[PDB]
Amino acid sequence: IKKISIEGNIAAGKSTFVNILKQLSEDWEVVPEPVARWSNVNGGNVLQMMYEKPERWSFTFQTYACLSRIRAQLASLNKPVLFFERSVYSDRYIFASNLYESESMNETEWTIYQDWHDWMNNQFGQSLELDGIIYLQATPETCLHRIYLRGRNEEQGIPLEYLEKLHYKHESWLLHRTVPILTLDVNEDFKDKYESLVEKVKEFLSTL
Amino acid sequence: IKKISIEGNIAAGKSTFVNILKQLSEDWEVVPEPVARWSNVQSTGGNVLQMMYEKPERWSFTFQTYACLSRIRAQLASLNGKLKDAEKPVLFFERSVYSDRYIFASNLYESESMNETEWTIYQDWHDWMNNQFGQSLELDGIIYLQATPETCLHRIYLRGRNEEQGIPLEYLEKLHYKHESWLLHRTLVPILTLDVNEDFKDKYESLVEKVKEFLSTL
Numbered sequence: 001i002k003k004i005s006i007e008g009n010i011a012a013g014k015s016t017f018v019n020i021l022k023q024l025s026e027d028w029e030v031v032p033e034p035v036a037r038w039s040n041v042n043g044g045n046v047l048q049m050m051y052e053k054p055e056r057w058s059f060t061f062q063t064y065a066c067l068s069r070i071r072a073q074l075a076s077l078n079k080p081v082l083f084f085e086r087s088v089y090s091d092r093y094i095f096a097s098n099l100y101e102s103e104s105m106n107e108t109e110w111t112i113y114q115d116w117h118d119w120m121n122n123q124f125g126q127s128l129e130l131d132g133i134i135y136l137q138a139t140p141e142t143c144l145h146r147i148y149l150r151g152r153n154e155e156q157g158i159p160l161e162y163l164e165k166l167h168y169k170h171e172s173w174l175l176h177r178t179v180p181i182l183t184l185d186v187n188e189d190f191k192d193k194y195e196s197l198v199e200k201v202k203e204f205l206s207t208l
Numbered sequence: 209i210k211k212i213s214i215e216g217n218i219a220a221g222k223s224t225f226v227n228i229l230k231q232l233s234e235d236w237e238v239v240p241e242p243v244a245r246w247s248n249v250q251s252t253g254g255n256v257l258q259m260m261y262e263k264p265e266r267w268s269f270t271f272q273t274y275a276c277l278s279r280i281r282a283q284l285a286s287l288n289g290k291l292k293d294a295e296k297p298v299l300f301f302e303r304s305v306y307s308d309r310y311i312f313a314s315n316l317y318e319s320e321s322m323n324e325t326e327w328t329i330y331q332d333w334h335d336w337m338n339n340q341f342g343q344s345l346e347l348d349g350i351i352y353l354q355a356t357p358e359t360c361l362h363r364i365y366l367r368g369r370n371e372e373q374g375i376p377l378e379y380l381e382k383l384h385y386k387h388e389s390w391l392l393h394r395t396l397v398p399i400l401t402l403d404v405n406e407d408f409k410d411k412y413e414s415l416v417e418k419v420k421e422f423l424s425t426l
């Protein structure tokens with residue numbers, strides 16, 4: 001199985017994109033971000049607790065988000081392509097890093113998280129090894145507008161500064177490079193105008 | 209390699225006991241609790257053990273997940289690294305992923321130190337880790353070092369760890385209840401119970417006789 005992660009800022013359009021991919025081919029499945037589990041752990045909405053009080057709940061969320069990704073991705077392993085919606089890499093190097101820099105995690109929480117992540121990666125790194133990255137790139141302002149379209153209750157307080165931080169981390173990782181990466185511009189609505197992206201995706205997969 | 213965990217209340221004498229067993233035989237190795245790591249957080253700074261006792265409604269979940277991770281890591285490392293030269297090898301775990309969950313974490317949830325959400329996430333985390341790494345660490349026996357809450361309290365006082373000084377008798381009683389029902393009443397694997405209310409630092413010969421007789425059946 002060729003393993004491809006779809007990376008991007010919040011509301012870039014990853015769920016929308018991967019839904020279109022799903023249907024294109026019998027040989028391609030998708031492992032979605034398990035967001036429904038994060039909003040209902042009846043249960044506690046930990047996604048929400050993290051947004052309301054990141055200093056209190058970030059580590060608990062991050063821990064669980066990461067665990068939930070690895071479970072889903074390990075479980076999905078059983079011309080086949082598997083598209084991962086995000087990855088253990090963006091878990092740590094985009095999101096968790098940003099929480100620490102932001103003082104949402106303290107040094108202790110951040111050490112504990114990395115220790116855990118290091119270890120998971122040792123044990124499961126070979127199997128969750130990515131063959132490529134599809135980067136859906138949209139300006140912070142576009143992602144901000146898409147947050148208010150989608151209208152999740154948890155995400156309504158999100159500062160543009162937060163999105164900018166996440167964006168910059170994506171750019172520096174995936175674009176500035178400071179693994180084969182295809183970068184797709186998703187600033188313009190693509191929900192119908194997607195034919196070019198798919199050919200580009202198809203052409204990327206064949207280089208691998 | 210027979211795997212035996214040593215269970216008991218806080219300051220029942222597991223470290224002391226484990227230090228003795230370590231030295232009695234070449235085929236007997238121990239995996240201590242990583243309390244050094246919990247006291248100064250670093251990867252293979254912060255005192256999470258202390259944070260957990262000063263503010264458990266804030267730090268309980270963080271401690272529990274870390275403690276459990278560090279335990280599995282320690283046990284797994286000794287499994288692969290120790291006892292290559294032994295004829296009847298036995299690896300003694302100071303505590304286990306079972307007491308983490310069924311004594312300590314359970315008790316913190318029960319005491320409202322973890323909320324429902326924290327408790328769910330921990331159980332999820334614990335189930336996955338146990339599935340992934342559980343068959344390697346499965347126990348062949350438990351040695352239960354039984355000491356009264358009163359005795360454990362005064363040993364906490366004797367050992368004098370700063371972090372532990374605010375620990376109420378009430379708290380040790382709950383932990384003791386959980387051990388009794390888990391290991392004795394079987395209302396919560398071969399179990400050897402050893403009464404350690406009297407000092408055994410220099411009268412351990414017949415505790416040890418008991419351990420050897422216990423191991424033979426396994």
Ligand SMILES: O=c1ccn([C@@H]2O[C@H](COP(=O)(O)OP(=O)(O)O)[C@@H](O)[C@H]2O)c(=O)[nH]1
Nearest residue numbers: 011012013014015016146149150189190191
């Ligand atoms: O071309 C697009 C792509 C996305 N969206 C909307 O933008 C929001 C976020 O897209 P998605 O959930 O796929 O984002 P993700 O967070 O998964 O990247 C949703 O309201 C989509 O319906 C849109 O209107 N046009």
Ligand SMILES: O=c1ccn([C@@H]2O[C@H](COP(=O)(O)OP(=O)(O)O)[C@@H](O)[C@H]2O)c(=O)[nH]1
Nearest residue numbers: 218219220221222223224363367407408409
């Ligand atoms: O027979 C004993 C067993 C223990 N202790 C003391 O009681 C404290 C708690 O023992 P230990 O640290 O081994 O307990 P743990 O928390 O590991 O159970 C330490 O001061 C020990 O020196 C003792 O005086 N005599």
Ligand SMILES: Nc1nc(=O)c2ncn([C@H]3C[C@H](O)[C@@H](CO)O3)c2[nH]1
Nearest residue numbers: 010033035062065090091095096155
């Ligand atoms: N803090 C935090 N850490 C992560 O690793 C992470 N991965 C995804 N998310 C957020 C983005 C969307 O709001 C929503 C679904 O993508 O949850 C995360 N938030």
Ligand SMILES: Nc1nc(=O)c2ncn([C@H]3C[C@H](O)[C@@H](CO)O3)c2[nH]1
Nearest residue numbers: 218241243272275307308312313372
């Ligand atoms: N909350 C909590 N959960 C655990 O799983 C746990 N395991 C050990 N301990 C505490 C008791 C002793 O102080 C000390 C040394 O064993 O650490 C724990 N405390």
